[PDB]
């Protein structure tokens with residue numbers, strides 16, 4: 001029968017929907033957890049190349 | 054028994070590649086990670102779903118019934 | 119109405135009758151599933 | 162059914178099986194259309210038969 | 215002439231009957247064993 | 263026989279005991295006459311609980327065994343009906359000691375104070391579980407309780423919107 | 431044994447209104463809109479659109495309990511501005527933005543061979 | 545998830561996560577109480593019962 005994924009996961013048309021924004025810590029939304037250096041501990045995201053450091 | 058139809062975490066369909074996964078492990082003698090990467094599994098959820106699965110259906114079918 | 123565990127052959131025995139398989143000495147005498155319609159949902 | 166598996170188990174596995182839904186908009190929910198016995202106008206019917214020899 | 219001695223299903227449990235078998239005991243008396251299978255899905259109250 | 267028991271004196275005579283003895287019983291008949299009889303004069307005991315007898319009062323409200331009624335005329339005696347006769351009703355009152363509180367009054371002089379679906383597989387039509395097999399357990403009137411085969415729950419749904427199927 | 435009706439989450443119940451608008455006495459020109467069988471998806475978007483409007487003063491959405499598919503949006507605007515008009519304008523703006531996004535995505539997909 | 549509690553994904557739960565099968569077996573016998581008297585496995589018909 002016709003249905004939506006909300007009723008049951010079997011109707012889910014998409015498996016993984018990756019959503020990201022603000023690769024570089026510009027808006028200070030996330031405070032990276034660091035012990036020695038924040039940049040070294042956390043590798044740069046793939047999308048970082050699309051924004052000015 | 055059988056490989057899960059969809060990944061528990063994301064829901065990606067991984068049951069199609071289970072036979073392909075076994076063939077790659079046996080026919081090509083490839084390691085687990087390389088075979089899974091070739092099959093097209095990026096997220097580790099599907100990686101652990103396929104790697105951690107156990108084929109108890111074959112064991113059950115060994116009996117006469 | 120009944121089947122053998124090993125032979126898996128129908129018996130269709132009635133009341134006041136032996137419950138042992140006719141083909142073999144085994145007498146598990148399992149019964150087949152009901153003919154009534156049965157429905158299940160993935161939910 | 163006489164497989165080692167269970168009817169509910171196989172039904173759940175079948176439920177997760179993807180099905181083509183390109184024309185899902187044309188299809189109507191069963192709960193909406195005034196039908197009886199899952200009319201094809203709101204449902205898709207398939208049959209599965211299998212046994213070793 | 216006779217009194218019913220059936221085995222009622224558990225009040226707090228329900229499910230789909232999976233199998234039923236009939237055999238003879240050591241003394242030859244009729245014996246029946248019915249296995250009922252149920253599908254239980256995780257819920258809030260379930261413990262992990 | 264005990265007190266207040268109903269005794270079938272004959273094919274058309276029914277009496278109520280007001281004094282239960284060993285072999286001697288004092289009984290008031292449908293006509294209100296109180297007489298003393300022996301144990302052999304009683305053909306059998308009428309079971310009030312199993313007796314499906316009903317009458318119509320002056321107001322038209324149905325009255326059954328055990329219902330409390332009050333006489334419209336006379337002393338307005340209030341009491342519970344023990345048995346219903348074709349033309350009379352026996353009423354026992356706790357406020358009356360005479361005749362063990364049992365009196366026979368006319369019904370018109372007092373005022374009161376098969377499911378085919380059951381046991382058959384069905385499918386719902388207009389609901390959230392339409393097309394789902396279900397087994398009917400009981401009906402409370404205008405609504406039928408059905409247990410779903412695939413769900414361990416009982417749901418009440420109107421029977422008119424359900425389609426019945428054969429055993430197989 | 432008594433799990434909630436999964437279909438009921440996104441389906442309106444018998445004799446139930448989709449939206450229930452009532453006045454709010456906490457502040458002047460304040461209204462409460464109860465949305466039935468709705469999740470954060472629509473409420474958050476509507477609230478964000480409302481906040482983007484200068485005339486809108488307060489717009490807050492609250493979900494009472496995860497069990498019930500229902501939430502309540504409190505909207506307060508300036509004097510002389512009916513909250514329903516602001517909500518309608520926000521919905522129209524959301525529709526226009528969604529249509530523009532769909533058109534742009536279709537154009538981009540058509541431009542790309544893959 | 546407080547007090548060591550946990551939050552489990554409903555989608556995963558309905559998609560095949562930690563689903564279980566419970567099997568319960570009931571046994572019945574025609575144990576004889578007195579010679580020449582034994583139980584009978586038949587559907588009751590409400591007659592003489």
Ligand SMILES: [Zn+2]
Pocket residue numbers: 060061062063064065096097098099100
């Ligand atoms: Zn996955």
Ligand SMILES: [Zn+2]
Pocket residue numbers: 122123124125126139140141142143144
């Ligand atoms: Zn045999």
Ligand SMILES: [Zn+2]
Pocket residue numbers: 190191194195196197199200201202203204
């Ligand atoms: Zn239809």
